[PDB]
């Protein structure tokens, strides 16, 4: 299937409590593999998956130097954004940044990303052509004009289309058993009474990887999108994921409903009924 | 646009002393760089900084140190540990550490084992040959600056009280008078060519001026001869029919 | 990383075109820049190139880029004395520092309209008994060599008398030895056959 590598950076100012806290993490697909925390004692990029510990000291030295430079840049940005929005020094604020790349089934480049938010809201993003920028508001326009005049995109496009893809390919090969795997969900269904004339049917999917999954309910073969409660897919903590979907049915009509499960690890979708 | 500056243009120190070279830029650049160049060789990267509060070693960092407390400044310290401090030192900057860099004017740093090796230049002007005037109707004056160390000199020609550039050629670099020996004293030559009629006017005044950069007040001097401090040494000649 | 420039140095006559090469890594290319570095000045950026096959031009200067094989050529048409300089090439990758080559040093020899080669003796203005010899007005085919003695000889230098549209080469020899005379000062150089040696 397709794959992706994504890096996520968060910097939070803390008025009256010192320099901002910076946390960085990297993912291949739904598997985390590195982190950096400006508040931790190590002051190093650290492994968070067994397969990345195969990299030697030069890799860890180099990733530490680079992420420390990221840390200081986003520290400056917090001060810059405070000025752009004419904010006081009293409030805590957050800068977020994500970048990375997608590849298809041939592991060839498919798409690149590089985008920012300030206080949970879109700030500036590199467009899909990897040549122009989307500026959320008037303050992001200042950044856009600066990055255009400086040719930032032409340099980023070399990373997103080239270097990023090379690293992803390398990681997929070196973490084959973990990353090029598919775990089909284990499924079952539960039944609870809501009132004396109504019941909840909850359809479960467990122990599946990757996180992408679809659960839908049907009544007499007809989708029930409006009356279906979904929960956010959640990690079990061992590398697999969990999810459920529920529907309230009139008691005694449980036989009219079917749950349908689609996952990359299933040869065909599953249909589940209440027994 | 702003600019990037370095100071001072010439530095001279006794071996074993630490010295810090200044580099400042109001170009709004985040990335700054330090290079050294030896005569005949290329640039060699000493240290760089991509952002305030971050610096990383180059290929020849041993004996050097930097700080980057402020975006606008990137000072380089040459510690006693540096084995061959004497070199030309260039600072540079760029918006974000990709694409073209912008270089400051550079600092020439010389260190010596002994301070008694410092000598100011002697300057002499040699007047045009009468054979030249008759053969070509032009007249070449030659200035010689000789016996100075370090090779930190700036030479200029002054005609009737105003510095001149037309008809002037100065050697690109001083020549060592005892090449095998180091440290050794240097010499430098320059020529000014004018019309014969212009040289034959006794109202015209020609002057060769050598600015020499040497010792300061802090340096201690117990030697017999005059203290070889920074000074201007000059020689002059007048036109003659 | 390794950036290789060639040749190390080269000499061309004013008006002739020239070109030199920069060889750089064939993988993970992010940008190439060219600089001009004149004597008594600092490097000044001429071109930045990122697109394979693109051609850049400024004045009489131009550059091409081939990222597949890792080559860039710099061309100067109708070269002028002002073009004399060291030209540097630099290579960017996924990093915050560029890799600089060691440079190509170009010397453009000026055209000399009417050569009149000669060796003149000049007298000091103040202190007596001092003198130098001035070899002057030779064309650019002449090369000046150092002496085989403790005699001092400077390299060829070009001065420009702007208002008269006139340029001339010269070299200076001096010494305080008893044998040193202008007749013999430049003996270690191959001098023009018709070089003028003024009588007494």
């Amino acid at each position: 299937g397709s794959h992706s590598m994504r890096y996520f950076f968060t910097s939070v100012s803390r008025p009256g409590r010192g320099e901002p806290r910076f946390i960085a993490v990297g993912y291949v697909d739904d598997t985390q593999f590195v982190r950096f925390d400006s508040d931790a004692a190590s002051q190093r990029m650290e492994p968070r998956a067994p397969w990345i510990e195969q990299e030697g000291p030069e890799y860890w030295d180099g990733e530490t130097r680079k992420v420390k430079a990221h840390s200081q840049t986003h520290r400056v940005d917090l001060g810059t954004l405070r000025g752009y929005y004419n904010q006081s020094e009293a409030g805590s604020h957050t800068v977020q940044r994500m970048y990375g790349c997608d590849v298809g089934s041939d592991w060839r480049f498919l798409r690149g990303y590089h985008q920012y938010a300030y206080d949970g809201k879109d700030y500036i993003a590199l467009k899909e052509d990897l040549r122009s920028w989307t500026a959320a508001d008037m303050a992001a326009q200042t950044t856009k004009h600066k990055w255009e005049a400086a040719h930032v995109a032409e340099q980023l496009r070399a990373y997103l289309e080239g270097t990023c893809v090379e690293w992803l390919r390398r990681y997929l090969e070196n973490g084959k058993e973990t990353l090029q795997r598919t775990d089909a969900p284990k499924t079952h269904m539960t039944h609870h009474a809501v009132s004396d004339h109504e019941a909840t049917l909850r359809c479960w999917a467990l122990s599946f990887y990757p996180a992408e999954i679809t659960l839908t309910w049907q009544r007499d073969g007809e989708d029930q999108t409006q009356d279906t409660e979904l929960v956010e897919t959640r990690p079990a903590g061992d590398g697999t994921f969990q999810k459920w979907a529920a529907v309230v049915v009139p008691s005694g009509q449980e036989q009219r409903y079917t749950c349908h499960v689609q996952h990359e690890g299933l040869p065909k979708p599953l249909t589940l009924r209440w027994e | 646009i702003g600019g990037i500056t370095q100071s001072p243009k010439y530095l001279f120190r006794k071996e074993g002393q630490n010295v810090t070279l200044s580099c400042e830029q109001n170009l709004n650049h985040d990335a700054m760089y330090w290079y050294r160049q030896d005569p005949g060789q290329g640039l060699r990267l000493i240290y760089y900084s991509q952002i305030v509060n971050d610096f990383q070693k180059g290929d020849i960092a041993a004996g050097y140190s930097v700080s980057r407390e402020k975006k606008e400044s990137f000072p380089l310290t040459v510690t006693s540990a540096q084995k061959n401090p004497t070199a030309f030192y260039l600072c540079a900057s760029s918006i974000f550490g990709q694409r073209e860099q912008y270089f400051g004017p550079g600092t020439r740093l010389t260190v010596t084992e002994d301070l008694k090796n410092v000598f100011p230049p002697e300057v002499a002007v040699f007047e045009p040959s009468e054979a030249e005037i008759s053969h070509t109707q032009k007249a070449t004056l030659v200035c010689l600056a000789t016996g100075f160390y370090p090779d930190h000199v700036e030479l200029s020609w002054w005609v009737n009280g105003k510095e001149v550039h037309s008809g002037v050629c100065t050697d690109p670099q001083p020549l060592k008078e005892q090449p095998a020996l180091n440290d050794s004293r240097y010499a430098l030559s320059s020529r000014l060519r004018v019309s014969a009629t212009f040289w034959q006017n006794p109202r015209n005044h020609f002057r060769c001026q050598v600015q020499f950069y040497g010792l300061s007040e802090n340096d201690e001097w117990t030697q017999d001869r005059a203290k070889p401090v920074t000074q201007i040494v000059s020689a002059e000649a007048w036109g003659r029919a | 990383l390794n950036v290789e420039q060639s040749p190390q140095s080269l000499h061309v006559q004013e008006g002739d075109s020239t070109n030199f090469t920069c060889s750089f890594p064939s993988s993970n290319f992010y940008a190439l820049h060219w600089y001009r570095w004149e004597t008594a000045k600092s490097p000044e950026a001429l071109f930045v190139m990122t697109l394979n096959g693109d051609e850049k031009k400024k004045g009489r200067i131009s550059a091409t880029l081939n990222t597949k094989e890792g080559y860039s050529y710099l061309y100067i048409k109708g070269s002028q004395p002002e073009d004399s300089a060291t030209y540097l090439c630099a290579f960017d990758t996924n990093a915050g520092k560029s890799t600089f080559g060691d440079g190509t040093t170009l010397t453009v020899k000026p055209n000399i309209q009417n050569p009149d080669p000669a060796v003149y003796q000049l007298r000091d203005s103040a202190s007596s008994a001092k003198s130098v010899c001035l070899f002057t007005d030779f064309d650019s085919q002449t090369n000046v060599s150092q002496s085989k003695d403790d005699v001092y000889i400077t390299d060829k230098c070009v001065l420009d008398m702007r208002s008269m549209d006139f340029k001339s080469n010269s070299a200076v020899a001096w010494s305080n030895k008893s044998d040193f005379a202008c007749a013999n000062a430049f003996n270690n150089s191959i001098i023009p056959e018709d070089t003028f040696f003024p009588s007494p």
């Binding site: 890799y59 992420v67 810059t80 920012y116 400086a150 340099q155 690293w167 | 985040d30 | 990758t93 996924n94």
Partner: peptide
């Protein structure tokens, strides 16, 4: 591997 260069907003 992450970006090797950085730029301010």
């Amino acid at each position: 591997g992450i970006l090797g260069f950085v730029f301010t907003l």
